[PDB]
Design a protein around this ligand. Structure first.
Ligand SMILES: N=C(NCCC[C@H](N)C(=O)O)NP(=O)(O)O
Ligand SMILES: N=C(NCCC[C@H](N)C(=O)O)NP(=O)(O)O
Length: 145
């Protein structure tokens, strides 16, 4: 149901929430996981849009701050859960049986709210346009399992 690289993104989302001392796995950690996974279609699409790993790291830490103490427990936020649910819908609508990193990215953009939306807004990203651009990239490339 998830590609191998989508599984890596979900691991890195949790990794980053712990590393930063946060008790939630939110949309901002999903975004960090997408860019830091560094190999999947989402990382390549984010990079094509001028959204690099170090920039996103700086924005999250600036907007939220660090917990100065690695967190003890971590649970997904309601919005992050909705992003993952939307990623399954996005994969379906594109004719994919497996949810890839790009479908998590499209779900995040489609949700269009939460901390990740503020990070993207700080980098001058219009979510509608980014959605259009991601879909243009997927329509230009073979991305099947
Ligand atoms: N860090 C967050 N959310 C904080 C938790 C929401 C909080 N319980 C509340 O009062 O809303 N990121 P996201 O974009 O919501 O996933
Ligand atoms: N569309 C993809 N990957 C192509 C298929 C990956 C393969 N189904 C697999 O099971 O890993 N996106 P991602 O960036 O690799 O998630």
């Amino acid at each position: 149901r998830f590609t191998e690289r989508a599984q890596k993104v979900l691991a890195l989302a949790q990794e980053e929430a712990l590393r930063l001392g946060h008790n939630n796995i939110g949309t901002e950690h999903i975004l960090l996981g997408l860019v830091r996974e560094g190999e999947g279609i989402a990382a390549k699409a984010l990079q094509a849009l001028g959204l690099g790993s170090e920039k996103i790291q700086k924005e999250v830490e600036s907007l939220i701050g660090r917990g100065q103490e690695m967190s003890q427990t971590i649970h997904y936020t309601p919005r992050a859960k909705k992003v993952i649910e939307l990623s399954m819908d996005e994969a379906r609508k594109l004719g994919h049986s497996y949810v890839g990193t790009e479908h998590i990215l499209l779900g995040l953009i489609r949700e269009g709210e939460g901390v990740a939306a503020r990070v993207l807004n700080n980098l001058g990203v219009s979510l509608n346009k980014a959605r259009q651009q991601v879909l243009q990239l997927l329509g230009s490339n073979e991305t099947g399992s």
